[PDB]
Design a protein around this ligand. Sequence first.
Ligand SMILES: O=C(O)CNC(=O)C(=O)O
Ligand SMILES: [Mg+2]
Ligand code: NI
Ligand SMILES: [Zn+2]
Length: 331
Amino acid sequence: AQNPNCNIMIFHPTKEEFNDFDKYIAYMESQGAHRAGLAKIIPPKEWKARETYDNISEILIATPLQQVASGRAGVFTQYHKKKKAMTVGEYRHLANSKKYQTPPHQNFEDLERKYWKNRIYNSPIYGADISGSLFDENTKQWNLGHLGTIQDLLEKECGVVIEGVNTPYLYFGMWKTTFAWHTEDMDLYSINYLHLGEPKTWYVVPPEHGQRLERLARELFPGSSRGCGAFLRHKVALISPTVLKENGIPFNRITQEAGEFMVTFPYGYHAGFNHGFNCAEAINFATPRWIDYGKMASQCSCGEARVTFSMDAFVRILQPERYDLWKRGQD
Ligand SMILES: O=C(O)CNC(=O)C(=O)O
Ligand SMILES: [Mg+2]
Ligand code: NI
Ligand SMILES: [Zn+2]
C-alpha cells in the first residue's frame, strides 16, 4: 500500500503532465497521496495563472465577514459577523493596517506559535465564497474555471442527468483569518490555488482516521454535538495541533505559498489560517473514486449548514433515504 503513514505528498508535474487534470489526480492517488487527505502541487515553471495581479482592486467583497472567536486558545468556535461591502483595494489596505497586519516573526513556525497563542483575542475580517475566477481564459492547464463538472461526473459514472452548476470561488484573507475543521460538501474533493500574497497554513486528518477527529470534536464541543449529529458541517470549530497531539489524533500540517495548488481528498478533514493579505481560488470536484464517499457523507439537517442549490441533486440521487430530512434542514 502506497504512503501508509499518510504523509502529505508534494508533486512537481512537468508541463506535459500538466495537460490532463484528471489523469494527474489519478496519478497522485496511485502514489498514495489521498491517504494524507491533502497534497501540494507545484506547477511547472512554464505555467502561469494569468499575466499580472495589478488590476484586481476593484473586485467587490459584498459581505466581508469578521471572525469572532469564543472558547480557549486551542479549542474555540468562531462566528461570522457581517460587515459593510468593500473593494479588494480597500480590504488590502485594511489587512495591511496596524490593527490587522501580520506581526514581526522569525519564520513560519514562529508565526504558527503566535497564531495559536493569540488568535482568539482578535477578530480578523475575511472575504469568502465570492463567485468568480482570476484565471485567464487562455490558461489551458489547471484552470479552476474549466474543470469537468461534478454533474457531468455523476452522469458519466451513474447515468443520471441532473440540474446544477459547479463554479469557482475567490477568497481574500488577512492575518489570522481562519478556516474551521471540515470536510467538503458531500465529502467532495477540493482544489485551491493561492493566487497572490502571504501563505496559508493547513492542517489535515487522513480520511481513514476522520472518525477519530469527529469523536474528539463531540467531546470538545458537547452542546454543539447534541444539537446536530454532523455539526462539523457548520464550519465553526477549531482545535489546535497541540490539542490534537494531546488526544492522539493523527494529523499533518503544511504551508502553501503563492503560486501553489492544494488538493483536498474525499473525507479529508482540514483547517488552517492565513499569514497575511492573500487571494485564493477554490472549487469542489469529483472523480469516480468520490462516488462511494458521496453516498456515505454525513449530513447536517438541523438548519445550520445551508448550502448551494447544486447539492440538492447530489443528496437526492446518492442519498435518497436522507433526502427528505436534509431538505427540511434546507427549508
Ligand atoms: O481559501 C480557503 O480558505 C478555504 N479552502 C478550503 O477549506 C479548501 O479549499 O478546501
Ligand atoms: Mg478590479
Ligand atoms: Ni475545504
Ligand atoms: Zn447541523
